[PDB]
Amino acid sequence: MVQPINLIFRYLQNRSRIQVWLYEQVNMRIEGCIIGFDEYMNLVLDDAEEIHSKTKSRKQLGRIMLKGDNITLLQSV
Amino acid sequence: EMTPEELQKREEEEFNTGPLSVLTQSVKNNTQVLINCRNNKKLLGRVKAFDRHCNMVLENVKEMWTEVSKPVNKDRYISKMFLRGDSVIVVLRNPLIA
Amino acid sequence: SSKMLQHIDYRMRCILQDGRIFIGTFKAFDKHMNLILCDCDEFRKREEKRVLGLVLLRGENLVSMTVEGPPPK
Amino acid sequence: MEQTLPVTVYEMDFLADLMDNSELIRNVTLCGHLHHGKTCFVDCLIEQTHPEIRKRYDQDLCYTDILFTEQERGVGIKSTPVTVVLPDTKGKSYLFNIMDTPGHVNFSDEVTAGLRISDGVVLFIDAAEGVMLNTERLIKHAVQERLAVTVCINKIDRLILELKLPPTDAYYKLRHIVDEVNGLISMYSTDENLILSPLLGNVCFSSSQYSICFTLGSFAKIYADTFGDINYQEFAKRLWGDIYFNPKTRKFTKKAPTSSSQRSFVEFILEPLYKILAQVVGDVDTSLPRTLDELGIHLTKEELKLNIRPLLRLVCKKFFGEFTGFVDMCVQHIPSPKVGAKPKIEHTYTGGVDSDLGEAMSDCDPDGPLMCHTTKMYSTDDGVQFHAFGRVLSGTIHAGQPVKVLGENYTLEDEEDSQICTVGRLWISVARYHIEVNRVPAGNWVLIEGVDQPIVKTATITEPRGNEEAQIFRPLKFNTTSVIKIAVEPVNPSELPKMLDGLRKVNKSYPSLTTKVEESGEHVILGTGELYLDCVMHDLRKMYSEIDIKVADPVVTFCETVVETSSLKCFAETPNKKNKITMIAEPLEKGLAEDIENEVVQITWNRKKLGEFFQTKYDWDLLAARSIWAFGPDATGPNILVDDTLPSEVDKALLGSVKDSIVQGFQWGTREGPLCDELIRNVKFKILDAVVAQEPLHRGGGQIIPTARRVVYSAFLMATPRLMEPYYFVEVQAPADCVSAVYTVLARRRGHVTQDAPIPGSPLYTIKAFIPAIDSFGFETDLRTHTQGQAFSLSVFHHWQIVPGDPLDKSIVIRPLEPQPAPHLAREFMIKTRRRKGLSEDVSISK
Amino acid sequence: TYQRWQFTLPMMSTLYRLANQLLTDLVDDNYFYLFDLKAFFTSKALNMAIPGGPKFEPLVRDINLQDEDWNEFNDINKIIIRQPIRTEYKIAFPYLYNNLPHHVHLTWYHTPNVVFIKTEDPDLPAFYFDPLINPISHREPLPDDDEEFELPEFVEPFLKDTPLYTDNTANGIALLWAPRPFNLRSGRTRRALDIPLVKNWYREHCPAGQPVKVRVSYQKLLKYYVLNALKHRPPKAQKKRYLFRSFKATKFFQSTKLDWVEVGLQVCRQGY
Amino acid sequence: KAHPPELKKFMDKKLSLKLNGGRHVQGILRGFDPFMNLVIDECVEMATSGQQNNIGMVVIRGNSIIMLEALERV
Amino acid sequence: MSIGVPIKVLHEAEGHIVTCETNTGEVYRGKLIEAEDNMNCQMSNITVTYRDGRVAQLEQVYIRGSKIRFLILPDMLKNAPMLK
RNA sequence: ACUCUGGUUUCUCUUCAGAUCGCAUAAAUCUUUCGCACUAAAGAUUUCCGUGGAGAGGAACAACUCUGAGUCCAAUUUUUUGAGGCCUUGCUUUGGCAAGGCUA
Ligand SMILES: Nc1nc2c(ncn2[C@@H]2O[C@H](COP(=O)(O)OP(=O)(O)OP(=O)(O)O)[C@@H](O)[C@H]2O)c(=O)[nH]1
């Protein structure tokens, strides 16, 4: 059985282009390279970029720290 | 928690060195504080006491709210009231105009 | 928490976060504020009564409650 | 509903609404060896669901031994149903239908009548004694009837307070008991999913006297409740077997840290229990309050003044609480009526599970066709009218509703035994008091009034004007055979009808009582032993007929057999003298009569499989092996009928017109037998030349059947006839010193000792021996008197063996009132049974 | 007023050891099988005598063993005799072995054997695998050790500082199997004359080898034991009226506290 | 004292998940924790636009978990 | 002092037919299979009604406790041992 | 965791007690039975040896052990927020309500 924490650690080791969903913000999606996590689900993305659904404008945010209380679902690629 | 000690005084350290120390400036110097509410309202007053939850009590608070007609800012005066910390968006001390 | 024990078995009306009104015999409550009301009826506004029975409403959904009728026999 | 009742923890409306949810119902039977603690299991349970019903300090109120003879005799004599709402470990409530069965080896028919209507079994196993005669017998019976088995190792205080074993050796004793049970289960069952282990929740540990009852999960939940942070379900998986606690790393390993380290069960479960008991019984004045403070138990000062046994009961009650390990065990491992309705129909319904009614019943749907099956009949104290007791397998029985009671001989073409009746009232039966209800849905047990007239032993109760093709449930198959035999007659012969009516009433009471009227106008009762027949006569005299009844000396039923093949082939012609049959008789091969009786083989099998069996198992050629015609006096009686008539010698097709009559003649003539009108056992009848008359008006009917019977008799008589004695299997538990006295007592009654062996962890011994059933009356009294009460035996029917002598020998001179030497026991047994049956003085050996 | 005693267990053990020369040292009531009150009741009602027990006189004149004719029922030519039907067999099963049984008090059946292993050394553990106990001949969905179950830091077996056995655990278990009053720890006082010290001596089996006078004495003691138990009438309801209190209420009597012997001489002379 | 959610019956089974923002998901469960966060293998987006997008190994926070539906027979 | 009376009423409600209302306005009615300390219920044979009113059948589910707004327990439970 | 009942011992009196009222077990009278009544049984009545329950009075020291009663939690799952803003329709109690579509 794969644990969410183990999966997050594996993704951080791989440093894949993790795309994270938003809580209640369906249109706004954020992709980035996972660097580290915490017990509060706080994630840090090296090369962050916000992707919209109606505008679809990829705006680079750089090194950002997304709170765990707002993330919805972490996807690769 | 790694600090289950009964003599828990770290709450005051955050009130002196952490982000919560800003409210301590308003408590000590008695400076006007403007806080943005989750209901799209702004209240300007003077906070007397608070806690880790951010629930503070303000005295002589002026509340501003915009209602649309077009958005027009309405003002109400309050002598004193208690505001929940979780029901606030941002709290900032009044800037020094001079 | 005797403030709610004195209201046990009383037919009370509860105002929810979504605006729904639940009138029924308040049976028990917990620290989480979960409401256990029996022979409950749902009141919504167009007025309409929707009888439910034993109602287990979560504490988060609890907003305000007031006594509507004395406990029955 | 409107009946005055003792106060309960629950409320009767909750009980009434639990009956409609057949996933919250558990139909359980409690069983075990005698005195292994079942009664107070339910009693201590009735206490916890009945706050005002409290056991007397110095005397246990058995509350399930409700009768009179049970009360002073101190044996369980009848099964008694109990219905209780019992909470679970997680606080959920289930409706338990518990059947409390007796543990005497004589009264096993009550156990089968309780196993029929149950979905699971709880076997009670005294922790000091261990696995005894009835434990093994009930294990066999309960895995045969396809019930889910759990185990309660009761009386575990005896390990602490009597044997005083070190906690580790108590652990070894419990593990040994569990292993014995597992071995028996695997002996009597192919599939492996009946593995019993306290790691599966399958085994419960208890001490009913002191209100102890736990599984591993409930004890781990005691820990979890006190120290809140442990997950009691994963704790429970580390509390048995060779798994040790490593207190430095706080982890459970499979290898003991260093040495002198205790297993997890000893360390975490058994040492605390030893220490509670030792503190209470030894240090009650000195340091009991400190440990009761440690455990969080506070006894009022008027309670620390209690005697040591009530104090121990109260302390253990406070620490443990309710019997939620029992409820956990039964809810997890005993199926609900809904889930266990498929094996029930598969096993006990004559219509097969594939029938449409065998489908509407296998859902346990309480809105379907009514199908209620009653196995017990409980008599109102006035002794006039009975109340049937069974379970509703489908539909719903209502008070006042007219029902159609089907007997045991009812078939779909012979519909004369069914009878319309009118249900009067319906009681949910707790042990002592009946709770009258208005309806009982499917999956529940009900006490019915109004259907008591047309049923003798068991019934299938259905609906009239519907259910047009509703067959019956198979009649109970019992553990034993009824062999002991007494004859009765009223003192004043003017009141014979009163005694006949009383005999009918006792026949209703006892599930395996068999009262018959012999040819001589003599009324006979068949029973299992001395306690059984003593209680039957007690009831007959004092309850059902209030007259004075004489009792004959106890005797046994015999059986007749042969020991070679008939010398000259015998024959018999019809009175027409055109039909001629010819037979010879020889003894069945060793170990085949049991296969025929124990349904290892049936004649319902196709000829191919039957022949294949006989071939591979007893060296039969395909010709004869497929030539079998019938099987014994029954459909499964221990006799065969073979046709060796060659197709060339006799027209096989023409012979087939008298097969159906030769079979009947053989069945009847094996049912009676020529020697003393006893059954024939272990005899093979080969036909040799059946000259058949072509004229159908000359053969068939009342012409050929008696000819078949007479040739059967003659063929049996030309092979050397013998008699047969029922042999009893005696198990005795006696101290090591009184073991030799057991040998001394046995040898005077033709008894032969198979084995004596110690009881592991117990100071006692078990002597197992075989004794003739006739040489057994007073054997229990002889053994318990010669040993000053220190030796005790339960004896049960085992096999049929040949009486030493030769029954057909007139050279033997028998005096009227003295015991014979063995050389001619058979002759006496034959002629005295002839005299008692009313037949002639001696046989007429002829053709 | 001396009407109730509350004792500790080290006192009850000491009183139990001292009395042992007067004590039976059984652990059961299986010794008294077919030799107990109910058995003697039944034997009296059936007009028979258990060998070693009381012999009463016929309860009621009725039919006799030489008064019933031959019938076809009880014909002695239909009867198989293997072992004679003793009278104990008619006491043990009073309804199977007996025509017209009345007043048959059903005897108590078995009682599970007590396997209390009596201790011999005070210098042995209380819980100890005695040599009188037959050995247990030695010979599992457990989870793997690597499974991540950890018992929290402040969790230990329930009573862990409490020692398993104390210096009065062996003695306080032996008190469970003691004869009353030693299986008590509190109770109500009796009068000195209400305590028979040998009533449990002659309720035992008639001893073999003693001369006939002793055995007849045993059975004669048992006869009056059974008659006392059977003819017992409940004490009638009344109003407490005490004679000597009425004596003291009047002015004619007075009180002192004398030696017993002095009052013995007084009573002797007074009666004279 | 966070007892793990009772989800062993749905382990390695095709399940449909409901998103907080009216979203829907699909995939095969692979594990869970006391916070209810689930790891799903062979995840299918199943967006409201009608086009199903396959992702694979994804992690979903328990806060946004709205409801679980076992597509496969359990 | 740990589990409230509503918790016991909800736990004992397993087995009967229960209707749960979620924060998303979806009503699921079915036979409860198991319930935990939290409101997390794993119902079965659920007739699901959407906000617009569409009716759907769901054989197996696991309702998230946080999203459960209010539920209607079976009428039989009104005489439960815990609720008395 | 703060306050208030209830005590125990002893002497006397009144009433009920079929409850092993007593973990003991006497005597008398009457009847019946048979012997032919210490050496014998059954039934009934009585008296004695002496107990429990309740109630009542007296008089001796303990008074709050006990019995009860009144008197440390902001980071998913409940109480320290995804909250607030835009559009249409029916009715507007012209305040807006109801549903849906949205933006955050
Ligand atoms: N030592 C000990 N004795 C017990 C225990 N439970 C019951 N007994 C006693 O053992 C005997 C068993 O009697 P019951 O429990 O009525 O017997 P049973 O198991 O119902 O069996 P049957 O007599 O066939 O009905 C009685 O003397 C009980 O008091 C126990 O846990 N420990």
- Kindly report the CATH number assigned to the domain that includes residue B96: 2.30.30.100
D127 CB under 6 A from ligand 1?
A: no
Give the neighbor-by-neighbor strand order of the sheet with D93-100.
Answer: D80-87, D93-100, D25-32, D120-124, D148-153, D203-207, D212-214
For chain F, the distance separating the N- and C-terminal CA atoms, rounded to the nearest angstrom, is 28
D382, burial (CB in 10 Å: exposed 0-12, middle 13-18, buried 19+): exposed
- Looking at chain D, after which residues does the C atom sit over 2.5 Å from the next written N, breaking the chain? none
Count Cα neighbours of D513 within 13 Å in the Cβ-side half-sphere: 27
Task: Specify the residue for token string 């859902």.
Answer: D363
Q: How far apart are CA D553 and CA D489, in angstroms?
A: 12
C-alpha triplet E247, E252, E257: angle, nearest 5°: 70
Query: Is the C-beta of residue B10 closer than 7 Å to nucleic acid chain H?
Result: no
CA distances from C55 to C23, D261, G13 (A): 10, 54, 12
3-state DSSP assignment of residue E232: coil
Q: How far apart are CA C40 and CA C56, in angstroms?
A: 10
C1' nearest to CA of C44: which nucleotide? H98
C66, burial (CB in 10 Å: exposed 0-12, middle 13-18, buried 19+): exposed
Q: How far apart are CA D203 and CA D223, in angstroms?
A: 19
* CB-CB contact of D361 with D15 (8 Å): no
* CB-CB contact of E127 with D92 (8 Å): no
Distance D224 CA to ligand 1 centre (A): 32
Other beta carbons within 10 angstroms of residue E161's beta carbon come to: 7
CB within 8 A of B81, min separation 6: which ones? B57, B58, B61
- Spell out where chain E has E strands: 5-6, 186-187
Residue ranges at the known binding site of D for GTP: 32-39, 100-104, 154-157
Query: What domain count does chain B have?
Result: 1
Please give the biggest Cα pair distance in chain G.
42
Which tokens belong to D619? Answer: 């060296």
Q: How far apart are CA D791 and CA E30, in angstroms?
A: 9
Pocket test for ligand 1, best of D33, D34, D39, D164 (most atoms within 8 A of CB): D39
> For chain G, what are the domain ranges?
3-84
Which tokens belong to D147? Answer: 């019930």
DSSP assignment letter at D388: E
* CB-CB contact of B35 with B43 (8 Å): yes
In chain C, residues 32-71 whose CB comes closer than 8 Å to chain G: 32, 34-36, 38, 52-58, 60-61
Q: Is the dihedral of CA B11, B14, B19, B21 positive or negative?
A: positive
Nearest residue in D to F1, CA atom:
D229
Q: Give the position, in ligand 1's atom list, of the atom nearest the Cα of E109.
A: 23
- Residue closest to D189 by CA, chosen among D230, D146, D155: D146
Question: Side chain identity at D798, as an amino acid letter?
Answer: H
* CB-CB contact of D128 with D56 (8 Å): no
CB within 8 A of A3, min separation 6: which ones? F31, F33, F39
Which tokens belong to D209? Answer: 């006297």
Q: How far apart are CA D554 and CA D827, in angstroms?
A: 19
Which value in Å is the resolution of this experimental model? 3.2
Q: How far apart are CA D197 and CA D687, in angstroms?
A: 55
Q: How far apart are CA D486 and CA D709, in angstroms?
A: 29
G15 Cβ under 8 Å from any chain D Cβ: yes
Q: How far apart are CA D288 and CA D284, in angstroms?
A: 5
* CB-CB contact of D440 with D19 (8 Å): yes
Query: Is the C-beta of residue G23 closer than 7 Å to nucleic acid chain H?
Result: no
- Note whether residue F2 is domain-resident: no
Q: How far apart are CA C48 and CA E201, in angstroms?
A: 88
Please give the biggest Cα pair distance in chain F.
41
Q: How far apart are CA D527 and CA D776, in angstroms?
A: 14
Q: How far apart are CA G56 and CA G58, in angstroms?
A: 7
Q: In this structure, what are the phi and psi dihedrals at residue E189, rounded to the nearest 5 degrees?
A: -65, 155
D699 CB under 6 A from ligand 1?
A: no
* CB-CB contact of D296 with D226 (8 Å): yes
Q: How far apart are CA G48 and CA G70, in angstroms?
A: 15
Contacting residues of D for E186, CB less than 8 Å apart: 305, 307
Q: How far apart are CA E123 and CA E127, in angstroms?
A: 12
Which one of A25, A73, A76 would you mutate to disrupt binding with F, by most F Cβ within 10 Å of its Cβ? A73
Q: D279-317: string of b/e by CB count within 10 Å (b at 16+)?
A: bbbbbbbeebeebbeebebebeeeeeebbbbebbbbbbb
* CB-CB contact of D230 with D236 (8 Å): no
Task: Specify the pairing of strand G68-73 against strand G17-22.
Answer: antiparallel
For chain G, the distance separating the N- and C-terminal CA atoms, rounded to the nearest angstrom, is 17
Which tokens belong to E64? Answer: 């006799």
For chain A, the distance separating the N- and C-terminal CA atoms, rounded to the nearest angstrom, is 23
Which tokens belong to D673? Answer: 């037998």
D38 CB under 6 A from ligand 1?
A: yes
- Residue closest to A72 by CA, chosen among F34, G51, G66, F66: F66
Other beta carbons within 10 angstroms of residue D527's beta carbon come to: 24
D696 Cβ under 8 Å from any chain F Cβ: no
3-state DSSP assignment of residue E89: helix
3-state DSSP assignment of residue C23: strand
Contacting residues of F for A11, CB less than 8 Å apart: 59
* CB-CB contact of D751 with D708 (8 Å): no
CB within 8 A of D269, min separation 6: which ones? D214, D216, D219, D239
Task: Specify the pairing of strand D459-462 against strand D402-406.
Answer: antiparallel
Q: How far apart are CA D398 and CA D437, in angstroms?
A: 9
Q: Which domain holds residue B22?
A: 6-98
Q: What fold, for G3-84?
A: SH3 type barrels. (2.30.30)
Task: Specify the residue for token string 């210096």.
Answer: E167
- Residue closest to E81 by CA, chosen among D238, D541, D653, D820: D820
Query: What domain count does chain A have?
Result: 1
Provide the number of CB pairs (under 8 Å) joining chain D to chain E.
311
* CB-CB contact of D206 with D213 (8 Å): yes
Kindly report the CATH number assigned to the domain that includes residue F33: 2.30.30.100
- Residue closest to C55 by CA, chosen among G75, D467, E193: G75
Query: What domain count does chain F have?
Result: 1
Q: Give the position, in ligand 1's atom list, of the atom nearest the Cα of D100.
A: 20
Pocket test for ligand 1, best of D40, D44, D160, D213 (most atoms within 8 A of CB): D40
* CB-CB contact of A45 with A35 (8 Å): yes
CA distances from E62 to B14, E67, E74, E85, E100 (A): 107, 9, 18, 21, 11
Across the strands, what pairs with D796?
Answer: D729
CA distances from D221 to D85, D215, D236, D719, E141 (A): 21, 10, 8, 71, 20
G45 Cβ under 8 Å from any chain F Cβ: no
Q: Write down how long chain A is.
A: 77
* Nearest chain F CA: its distance from D101 CA (Å): 38
Task: Specify the residue for token string 């023409």.
Answer: D654
Nearest residue in F to D225, CA atom:
F1
Chain F residues 13-52 within 7 Å (CB) of strand H? 21, 33, 35-37
Secondary structure tally for chain C: helices H, strands E: 1, 5
Count Cα neighbours of D123 within 13 Å in the Cβ-side half-sphere: 32
Q: How far apart are CA D756 and CA D754, in angstroms?
A: 7
* CB-CB contact of E202 with E210 (8 Å): no
Task: Specify the residue for token string 């088995």.
Answer: D149
User: Is there a contact between C53 and G7 if contact means CB atoms under 8 Å apart?
Assistant: no
Which one of E12, E106, E206 would you mutate to disrupt binding with D, by most D Cβ within 10 Å of its Cβ? E106
Contacting residues of E for D199, CB less than 8 Å apart: 140-142
For chain B, the distance separating the N- and C-terminal CA atoms, rounded to the nearest angstrom, is 44
Q: Write down how long chain B is.
A: 98
CA distances from D635 to A24, A47, D596, D629, D701 (A): 76, 87, 9, 11, 21
Which one of G26, G68, G70, G75 would you mutate to disrupt binding with C, by most C Cβ within 10 Å of its Cβ? G70
Task: Specify the pairing of strand D639-643 against strand D679-680.
Answer: unpaired
- Residue closest to E106 by CA, chosen among D502, D503, D62, D531: D531
Which tokens belong to D453? Answer: 């007239």
Other beta carbons within 10 angstroms of residue E249's beta carbon come to: 9
Q: How far apart are CA D127 and CA D156, in angstroms?
A: 5
Q: How far apart are CA D643 and CA D658, in angstroms?
A: 12
G34, burial (CB in 10 Å: exposed 0-12, middle 13-18, buried 19+): middle
Contacting residues of D for G80, CB less than 8 Å apart: 14, 93
- Note whether residue F33 is domain-resident: yes
Pocket test for ligand 1, best of D209, D532, D762 (most atoms within 8 A of CB): D209
Q: Which helix (H) or strand (E) holds A20?
A: strand A17-22
Q: Is the dihedral of CA D475, D479, D485, D486 positive or negative?
A: negative
Which tokens belong to D563? Answer: 């020991």
* CB-CB contact of D1 with D13 (8 Å): no
- Note whether residue B1 is domain-resident: no
Nearest residue in D to E29, CA atom:
D789
Alpha helices in A1-77 (DSSP H): 4-14
* CB-CB contact of E9 with E175 (8 Å): yes
Task: Specify the pairing of strand F38-44 against strand G27-31.
Answer: unpaired
* CB-CB contact of D804 with D825 (8 Å): yes
Question: Side chain identity at D97, as an amino acid letter?
Answer: N
Query: Is the C-beta of residue E227 closer than 7 Å to nucleic acid chain H?
Result: yes
CB within 8 A of E76, min separation 6: which ones? D816, D817, E70
Instruction: Strand H: list positions under 7 Å from protein Cβ.
Output: 9-19, 21-26, 33-34, 40-43, 46-53, 65-68, 72-86, 97-100, 103-104
CA distances from A70 to A73, D113, F20, F23, F62 (A): 10, 65, 11, 15, 11
Query: Is the C-beta of residue C65 closer than 7 Å to nucleic acid chain H?
Result: no
The reply to whether omega before D511 is within 30° of 0 (cis) is: no
* CB-CB contact of D833 with D723 (8 Å): no
Contacting residues of G for D13, CB less than 8 Å apart: 79
- Note whether residue B55 is domain-resident: yes
Q: How far apart are CA E190 and CA D1, in angstroms?
A: 51
Q: How far apart are CA D292 and CA D312, in angstroms?
A: 12
DSSP assignment letter at D473: B
Question: What helix, strand, coil percent values describe chain D, rounded to 5?
Answer: 30, 25, 45
- Residue closest to D713 by CA, chosen among D583, D529, D577: D583
Task: Specify the residue for token string 């003044």.
Answer: D305
* CB-CB contact of D296 with E164 (8 Å): no
D103 CB under 6 A from ligand 1?
A: yes
Q: Which domain holds residue A18?
A: 3-77
Q: How far apart are CA D316 and CA D281, in angstroms?
A: 12
Q: E52-87: string of b/e by CB count within 10 Å (b at 16+)?
A: bbbebeeeeeeeeeeeeeeeeeeeeebebbbbeebb
- Residue closest to E53 by CA, chosen among E87, E22, E83: E87
3-state DSSP assignment of residue E262: helix
- Residue closest to E15 by CA, chosen among E204, E197, E184: E184
Across the strands, what pairs with D394?
Answer: D371
**Exp. method:** cryo-EM
Other beta carbons within 10 angstroms of residue F28's beta carbon come to: 18
Q: Which helix (H) or strand (E) holds G9?
A: helix G5-11
- Residue closest to A45 by CA, chosen among A24, A74, A6, A23: A74
Chain A residues 8-47 within 7 Å (CB) of strand H? 22-25, 27-28, 38-42
Please give the biggest Cα pair distance in chain C.
37
CA distances from D188 to D138, D176, D184, D185, F57 (A): 11, 19, 6, 5, 50
Q: How far apart are CA G2 and CA D62, in angstroms?
A: 37
Contacting residues of G for C53, CB less than 8 Å apart: 72-73, 75, 78
Secondary structure tally for chain A: helices H, strands E: 1, 5
